[PDB]
Amino acid sequence: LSGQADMIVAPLTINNERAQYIEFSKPFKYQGLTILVKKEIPRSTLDS
Amino acid sequence: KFVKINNSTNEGMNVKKCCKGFCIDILKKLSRTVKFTYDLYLVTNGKHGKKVNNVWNGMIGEVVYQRAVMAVGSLTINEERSEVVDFSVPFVETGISVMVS
Amino acid sequence: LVTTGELFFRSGFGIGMRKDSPWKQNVSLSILKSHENGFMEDLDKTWV
């Protein structure tokens, strides 16, 4: 909503708060949002 | 809906039989939010859409000819369909898969 | 690291645009045609 602009090609999630001023096209990738968690080496190796 | 009278007879009585499910709920919610009224009815000839000799077998055929606004149901977004009628934002992701056992 | 949980707030990405421009119909049709042609699937597989 500015000057040069004229298109946007990037990950831009579809949402209600952004669909009034502008409009999008048919989605080219369906993707939700998940949880990413850290990992550690298991201690149940019977080392002792 | 429309049901043919027996098999040989070409008449028919438009009986009333209420239908329900997944998409009907979203139709009801849309009606509540946008505050309009509807008189939904089932299709008569064929099923879904398949152009043949520049003729569509209902569904799409009943929206192209300005005979029924909107086509609520299980309609897959395609390449030729989007050129005749105008679709909206999808709400369920789907495609082609396999079912071997 | 590992990704756990289940998908929620499922949506899709999309190419942006400004207000109303003539590019809308052509862009949407081209994206749909590419999607149904398997080109997008192959490119995504190769790059991801």
CA dihedral B31, B32, B34, B39 (to 10 degrees): 20
Q: Quick one: resolution in A? A: 3.9
What separation in angstroms does the CA of B63 have from each of B1, B36, B59?
17, 19, 7
Compute CA A23 distance to the chain's CA centroid, rounded to the nearest angstrom.
Answer: 18
| Structural contact between residues A15 and C10, judged by C-beta atoms closer than 8 angstroms | no
Cβ contacts of A1 on chain C, cutoff 8 Å: 18
Residues 6+ apart with CB under 8 A from B15: B1, B3
Chain B interface includes A38 (CB < 8 A): no
Q: Where are the alpha helices (DSSP H) in chain C?
A: 23-36, 39-47
Task: Look up residue B79 and give its two tokens.
Answer: 């390449």
* All residues at 6 or more sequence positions from B41 whose CB lies less than 8 Å from its CB, including other chains: B1, B2, B14
Give me the amino acid identity at B19. C
C9 touches chain B (CB under 8 A): no
Q: Answer whether C36 sits within 8 Å of B83, measured CB to CB.
A: no
A5 interfaces chain C, CB cutoff of 8 Å: yes
